[PDB]
Each structure stands twice: as structure tokens, then as C-alpha cells.
Design a protein around this nucleic acid. Sequence first.
RNA 1: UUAGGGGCUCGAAGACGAUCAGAUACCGUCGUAGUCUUAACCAUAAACUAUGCCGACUAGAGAUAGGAAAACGUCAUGACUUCUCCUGCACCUUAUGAGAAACCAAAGUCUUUGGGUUCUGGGGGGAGUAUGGUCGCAAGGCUGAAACUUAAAGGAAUU
Lengths: 80, 99, 198, 117, 87, 129, 225
Amino acid sequence: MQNDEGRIVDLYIPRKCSATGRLIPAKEHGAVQINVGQVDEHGRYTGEYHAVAISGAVRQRGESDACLNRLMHEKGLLSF
Amino acid sequence: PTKRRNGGRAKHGRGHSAVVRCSNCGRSCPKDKAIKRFNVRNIVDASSQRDLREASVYNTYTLPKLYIKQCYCVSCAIHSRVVRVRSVEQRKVRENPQR
Amino acid sequence: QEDSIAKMLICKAHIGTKNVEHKMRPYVFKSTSEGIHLINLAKTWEKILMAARVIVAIENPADVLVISARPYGSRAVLKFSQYVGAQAIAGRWTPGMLTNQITQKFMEPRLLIVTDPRTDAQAVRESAYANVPVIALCDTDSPLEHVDICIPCNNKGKESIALMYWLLAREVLYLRGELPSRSVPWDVMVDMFLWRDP
Amino acid sequence: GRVRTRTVKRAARQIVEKYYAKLTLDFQINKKISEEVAVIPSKRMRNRVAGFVTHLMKRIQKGPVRGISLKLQEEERERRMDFVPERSEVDVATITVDQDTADMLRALDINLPNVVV
Amino acid sequence: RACYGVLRHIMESGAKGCEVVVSGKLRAQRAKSMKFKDGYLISTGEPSKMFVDQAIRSVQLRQGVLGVRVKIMLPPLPDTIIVMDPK
Amino acid sequence: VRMNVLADCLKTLVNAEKRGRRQVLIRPSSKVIIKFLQCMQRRGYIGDFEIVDDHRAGKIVIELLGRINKCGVISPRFDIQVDKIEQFCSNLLPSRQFGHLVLTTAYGIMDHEEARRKHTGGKILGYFF
Amino acid sequence: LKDWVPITKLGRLVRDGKISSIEEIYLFSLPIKEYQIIDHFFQPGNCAAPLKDDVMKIMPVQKQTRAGQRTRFKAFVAVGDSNGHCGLGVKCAKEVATAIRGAIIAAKLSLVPVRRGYWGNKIGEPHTVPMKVSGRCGSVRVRLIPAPRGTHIVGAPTTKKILGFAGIKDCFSNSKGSTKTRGNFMKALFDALSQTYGYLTPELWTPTVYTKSPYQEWSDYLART
RNA sequence: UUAGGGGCUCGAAGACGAUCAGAUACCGUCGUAGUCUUAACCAUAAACUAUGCCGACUAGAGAUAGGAAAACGUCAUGACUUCUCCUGCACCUUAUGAGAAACCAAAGUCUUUGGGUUCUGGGGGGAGUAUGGUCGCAAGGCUGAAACUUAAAGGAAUU
């Protein structure tokens, strides 16, 4: 949301749910943000991670986990 | 408003069911909506039947049971306390009490 | 590696119920005669490797909960609270933990873990008021609604619950760096996680 | 009836938590004991709480009682919690599989020592 | 505004609880008794007469007389039992 | 029975959009739909799509993103006169800034933004935003 | 007045002054449970500007029980600071002033940010509902439409106030259904404005950054009591 | 209802006997038309799923009726078990889908408003009345007003 020349007007940007790509509003208290930690060789290790967020619209279906598998198959660390 | 989704008659894809007369009232109700208790029972109670086991001819005898199918009117049932009446939540259950 | 999959046979963790949910169906395979369904034991252990990496990457481990209504969880969960330094509840949950600030058992966790989402559904309902991601040990019966990250096992067997909470604690510890090498299996036995009759 | 209110319950229940030592199953020492440890204003109330203290001590004698912190059981509950045998698994090498359960690993791979009963 | 100010002083002073009733007509021709209460206040028994203190006055206005009650619970009760810790 | 082919497919699309599917198949497919989907695809509202060549009307399978709030159809296909493209989208579209009317014209199927600068109206077909 | 003892993770962080402003809370979608959190951000003079509260309506409600009737008063209160922040709250109580206290507390707790747009050309601070946004509550449909600058607000007097407390300068209101029930009408108007951020434009097609939460970055403070 | 058959039982009318202040009713005992059938009429019922008819897409589980395919399946062309497919009457669970709510896989996909089409409604009475028309052997059916009247009728839930 720009105007005239630069200056991103408005306050903040709503997070976009990974599973549906649909924006999470202010008062969705059923929203989630997972952190999943990486590992080095013979790890061990955390602190570097893949963040991922999903809305309460997706969760109350029961389709949270099936989509969250897809979002960490493409990263590498599952093999479904 | 609909007090029952069913309507209490339990009829689907007919347009016309069979009819039965109530065993007490007299009333023509539909067979589906009748409310029926098939009362099997032996003839001489339980306490009184030992007289027949004492008195009788033959070494043992099975006292043969009386088989009747009662059919009721709703109004005859609720008066006679076969069904009485239930809450809005507990209405929906269709199982057997006294299996 | 192979040995966790070998131990899952001794658990009877591959066994589940007659009825199977639509969501839980992918894990189950080759339903047996008698109408009992079997779980892919690769797909169980791959999701403990998932679920360990979620629990690690939390700074304070006390912000994790572990919950169980059923009494087979009670000795299991209270040993889990030692090694991963987490809060723990057993028995009756008392709703308005996560809502209701005034109540003196007001806990505001980041992550939440459950045995069965069927038996303590009231915990899993309350997670959706406070932005708390769940983890669950699912059976083929149990629902996935407000459940992130299933770990599909036998829930009802008293052996089988322990031998998940053994593998998580062990899995979490290696990630944590608590265990220096993977030549040793572990110091502590399985049988600290169990349940006894008296 | 002689049902006791929560003010009568709480006081008698709190005594056996912490002052469990001392008082015996006997009543007439407990009537005296209750008064000294804690304030009780009236004479009728001191018997009614002390009767319920001896009722709890009988129930503690009979079995383990719910709702009492005492912690003696915990000290002794933790000794049950502490104990462990040799092992309930890796026992012994081969595991009693079935027709269906063995054919998981034949499809899935992972080689192991197995049985087919 | 007046009755809260009187109720605030006795609560600040270190009374355990209180109430203040005002009967009689008020913004109306029919009578309508307003009631104000904060902190617990027993009504019954011999422990009423000691541990409460209670008072009543008249007060006279253009349209009629108002009532005014006050009742104030004070700080060895019958009901409460304070049990010691042994160490 | 089945009068508008385009009208069925956009309801099929917008349902399985709101449910939140990765990809959907539609049927029976046509020359109009691929051209209607092509002018969504320029503006960046859906990804790729295949069109299986079964020996029949055919099935169109689209990859899609979480981007279309809605697409619809205006039966009857009204005529509009370049003056009156501005009057329609004031009524129809959610704002003046974003969204598209889309309308068949003798220089091909196109958006109302393209129909203004080519300077030719035609029959209105549908919309999306 | 007064030094409240913060309860919960959010309460502790705000008093210390670790979280900067409420857009950080609204991003990660965290429930604000005490009103003392939101009292902190809107400080007098400092706030620019302080939150303003107006009492929309007072309605007497009666329950017929046994002998006599008991009447309680239900107080609708909207509250907002012009510049995109608005709220809507209700409470009932036996006296009138005791309802309005708790109504203002509930209004602050249900405080929602409102994005705002330009109607065509886009120069010099936004002034409108950015698209045609509907809201419903209980057979009251309300539809807010962008208007050109200087249009002002077109709508019911009730409509002017709670769009006024958002900061929306220009509108065209429509209103189907029974607008007589002001309890439903305010909720319908309010839940329209709540959905403004929820609606996805081509301006927000770019994939998100994912910053750390305020729960994450100030975890080590929340270890100690 | 009309004209022939048949007429057991039940039974609008009618008859007495009870009950009651009265009781032309409930209850009881008789009992003609009718009930049944061939040949014409009549054309309405809470004729109800009080939800028009085709079409697309939305969500699962277990039953069930009909047909079809598979299994070294179990017992003797068929019965049963396990599994999939369409086509039926439904049922349970749930919804960031809808609704005023009751409730609803349709009453969903509708202010983010347009797949095709038939019929009907516009506060409550007056009134389904009056008059005219037309169908009917009649009973009545279909079509169908006004003067005057009135601030509420009506729906779903709560105490």
C-alpha cells in the first residue's frame, strides 16, 4: 500500500497462512506459527529453523497436518 | 415449529402406510406411528406357577407362554405410562432401554 | 534407526481400532482379517523426527505442556517432565487453564502435547483460544481437529504410550545435545515410563 | 442427619495432612490434641472436628485416601516411582509377529530377526 | 455520588465489609429504595450483634422524608478456624 | 439441462478456491474457458493449467494460488458501449483500483482495461477479483 | 492511578516497555486480556491521540422472575482514536454507571485495526474504506463503499460516529434489515471494519517475511518472575 | 351424487338408557343412508418433505434395497464373509457454509448480489364473501372485487 512516491502507508502487514495463502487477521486467536529446527552433520544443533504459519480456518477442518506435511516435504526433511 | 425431524411416524417414500386399531383406545392410527410392545409372558406369573409344578401330571412340564402384539395410540400410551415424555436433547436417542 | 522400528513390534503400537477416520487413513495400510488396521512404522518414526525438531527450538522448556487424562499416561508424563524440563498435568484438566487469567492454575504455554485428542478434547479446544500449536498421539479413531502433527500409534495400550514418550525424550535429548554420542543408546531404561497396578 | 459442613471438613482434613503424627485412632487423646495445635472457639465444635479426625485416621489405616497431601505416600510413592527391573524389551532377539504384521517389513524393508506364528 | 463517598471512607478505614441503604422517593413519585454494598456482611445469630454496627436516621426533603441505613462489619469469630503449621 | 459451460466451471473453481485446494479439474472444457483462463493468467490470478485431450469435450486441470476471492459470470451476455464500461464496474467490481471485467469483442476476448485503449466495446462475459 | 500487577506474558512485557506498539501484537494475533496493556499505548498527550470513548446507547433489560421484576441496564460503548483504531464493547449491570465502566473495558479489549484506502488517485494520506466491504450481524446487512475525497460520511447518525472513531472520512452506507436494533447495527458496522485487513488484494501477493514473535524474542525475561 | 347388484361387521341421522344444574355430547344398547362391486359423475384434503422442476460443484463414517465385477475366501447355480462401482429410500457426525432463530448436505456455493425456466405473495380484517362469467345432475369447483374497518395481526426462542 504505497502513495505518491514510496512510503508504505498503513500499519503492519497480516501474515499469510502457508497452507491456504490467505491472510490471518488481528483477532484470529486460533492461528499458529510453528518453528522447526535444523541440524548440522551429526546433529544435534538448533537455532536455525524453517518458520511456518497456518490459520484457525485450516485447523478446525482437521486439514492442518496434511498441509504441514507438504510444507516440510519440499524443504527436505520428510519423504512422503 | 417441527417438534420432531421425523414427525413421529417414521415414513419415507410411501405416501400411504397400513393402519392398526389401538388395543385400548379404539383409535385408528397409522401402523408406523402406533408404538408397539410385543409382550411375551408366561400365563401364571412366577410366584403362583410352583403350584402347577407341584400338582401336575408328567415329570416336568414347560408352562407355555402367551404371545400378543400390543398396539397403542400415543394418548393411550402416555396415559398408561409406557412412554411418558422426554427432554429436547434426550428425545433423539432411539436405542433399547431394557435390552 | 532400525531398532526403534523393531521395538514398535514389542509395543503393539502398529495395532489400532476397527473404525478409521478419513484423515487418519493415509497412515493405515493392509487392514487385516478380523477388521483390525495396521500402521506404517516408517511413517510413525519419521513424525517423531518431525516432532522432536518442533519441541527443540524452544528456549524455556517449561513453556511446553504435556497432558494426559488416562491413568497409563500419568507415570509416563511425569518422567517426561524431568528430562525435558516441562510442565505436566495428569487427571482432571479443569477448563479455563489457557483462558481465564484470574484462576490460580493459569498457564500460558507456547507448545502443547497430548496423548489422545478424544479423551482430553477440552485441552485441544482451549488451544484455539490462545494460539497454542498442538502435538497428539493419534489412533485411527481419534480426531485431527485443532491438531498439528499426528504421531499415529496405539493410544489405548499401556506399554505403547510409554515407548513413544521414551523415543521423544531420547529424540529431544540428542537434538538438545544432552547426549554426546550415538554409540550409546541411553542411560535410563524404558521401564521408568510404564504403569503399575498398585 | 450428622453430615458435617465444609468448615468442619476443612479444619479436620487440614490437621491430618501435617499433624498426622501424634494423634492415634483413639478419640479422647485427639479431642485434647486438636485444641492445642489450632484455635477452636467453642466446645461443641472441638468434638465434631476431632471425631472426624479419628474417622480420617481409620480410613488412612484401612487404605490410601484421596484428597490428603500428607506426603508420606509421596515419599513412598516416589520409591515405587524410582524402582526399575532389567528390561521389558529387546527380549529376546526375535519378536512374535503374524502373517499380516511380518508382511509390513517385507514390503517396507528394514531387515530384522523375526517370527511367523 | 454521596453514598459511594461514605462507602469509600469506611472501606478505606479498615472495616471488613458494609452496606448503605437509602429508602424513600427519589427521582419519582412512587418510592424506590436504592441499595449499596461492598464487602461481606452477616445478618444472623448472636455473632451479628457484636461484629456488626448498625444505625438509622431520618432526613427531610422538599417532596418528603428519605430513610438512610448504614451497617458496618468489624474486624475471635465462630465460623473461622486458623490452623498452625508444625515445621 | 446444462446451458452455460463457462458458468458451471467458475462456480466449480470458486468453491474449491474457498475450501483451499491446490488444484482443481473442470468439465466439459471449451475454447471460451481457455481464453477466459488465459486473461486471468496474465494478471497473475492462477498458475499453469493442462487440458487433457480425451476424445470428448475434454477436462481442464488448473494449478491455482490463494489469490482469487471470487470469479463469476454475467448471463445474460449484455451489450456495452465504451461509455458504459465505467458504469458497470462502479456497480459490479469491489473497487476502482483492482479487479477486472472481462468481455468478448471483435478483436478477441479481453479485459476492460484492454477494451478501453483498443476503443471497442462488446458483449460482457464475466469478471474476477 | 494506578500500578497494576501485570498478569500473563503480554502484561509483563508491555509494562517493562519491550513491545514497541500494538501493530506488533496484531501481527502475531495474540489475545490482549487486560485493558491495562492498551491503556499504556494510548497515553495522554503522548498517544497522538488519546483514545476517546462515547456511550452509544443505554437499554433497560428486564427479567420476569417470581414476584416483581428485575431490571438491569445494558450499555453499548464504542471507542476509538482517529487514525485506524476502533473498538466495540457491551456490558449489563444493576446500576447504570457500573455498566459503563465495564463496557469501556470490554470496548478496549475488543480493539481492532482498520486498513484504509484511496478511491482512485492516491495522494496524501488514506481517507476511505479501501473496497466495497460488507458486514452482517443478526439480520442487519451493512455495506461500506469508497467515496471521493471530501464526500464526508453518508449514513445513519449511528453510522457517522463509529466510522468517525475509526478515522474513515468518506463513505457511502447502505443498510438492509432492521437498523432499529442498535446493538446489532453497531456489531454489523464493526465486523465490516474488522474484515478490511482480512481481504486480500494484489498489493499483498508478495510472500511474507516471518519475523520472530514478541513471545520468542523476550522469552528470557519471561523465564524469571 | 346417479343407475343396477350385494348388504357380514362397523355405523353421520334417528331411537331410547345413563351422567349432569341442564347434555340434542363424551359412555352404553339397538340402528336406515353409507361402507363393498360394475357403470357414469364429482375434482377437493394438514392431497405435507407445509421445502417447484432440470444441471453443476461442495464431507466424511457406518448401515440399507436393486444390479454388476473381483477373491487359490468359508460352508454346500445359491447362501454367507471381505472389498469397489454406480442407482434408490434414509440416518448419524460436523462446518471460517447459511439462517431471525427453530433448524438446514440443502434452507450451502446470494451486497464477494446474474446457470435455465414455470407458478405464487405485498400489514391485519371485510372475504374466498358480493356481483358477473364458466364447469357441475346437485352438493359445490375454478376465476374473484369494493365500500367501510383497524395499530398492530404473524414468526422463533427467553424468563
